[PDB]
Design a binder for this molecule. Structure first.
Ligand SMILES: COCCNC(=O)CN1CCN(CCn2c(CCc3ccc(OCCCN(C)C)cc3)nc3cc(-c4c(C)noc4C)ccc32)CC1
Length: 124
């Protein structure tokens, strides 16, 4: 079955808002979220609904944009790099589990290229 989703809150961690984290939520995440290809990435991979019995043997660090969105909304991230790392993990998991040329891989590739375009405009 599925593991519990990644934590989206950490009560022991202090919180702050930064210009880069605001930009990651309001521009980066929002832009990817509305993309034609976003739906498969808007929530944790559900291995029982999608019938993927080996998914969590192969992918031990799941990540998805629904989790990233809640993390941003909950001020879970202290450093903007934490959020960028989660996006990268999401994309890399997709490339590891699936085969090159699969529909989902070409969708991740389009989302990643757009992610990189938006991250390039991150404010100082
Ligand atoms: C270039 O390409 C052209 C454009 N693409 C297309 O036109 C092709 N299509 C796009 C839409 N896709 C949605 C399908 N999809 C979803 C949608 C959410 C969902 C829907 C139904 C469901 O359960 C009901 C039962 C459903 N059962 C019968 C399938 C549970 C979840 N989440 C996915 C995660 C994964 C994935 C992730 C991420 N990492 O590894 C894997 C595995 C893969 C595919 C996924 C299909 C292909």
């Amino acid at each position: 079955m599925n593991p519990p989703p990644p934590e989206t809150s950490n009560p022991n961690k202090p919180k702050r808002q930064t210009n880069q984290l605001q930009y990651l939520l309001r521009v980066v995440l929002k832009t990817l979220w509305k993309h034609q290809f976003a739906w498969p990435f808007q929530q944790p991979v559900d291995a029982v609904k999608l019938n993927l019995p080996d998914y969590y043997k192969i992918i031990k660090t799941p990540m998805d944009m629904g989790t990233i969105k809640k993390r941003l909304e909950n001020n879970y991230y202290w450093n903007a790099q934490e959020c960028i790392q989660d996006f990268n993990t999401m994309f890399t998991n997709c490339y590891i589990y699936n085969k090159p040329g699969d529909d989902i891989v070409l969708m991740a590739e389009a989302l990643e290229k757009l992610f990189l375009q938006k991250i390039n405009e991150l404010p100082t």
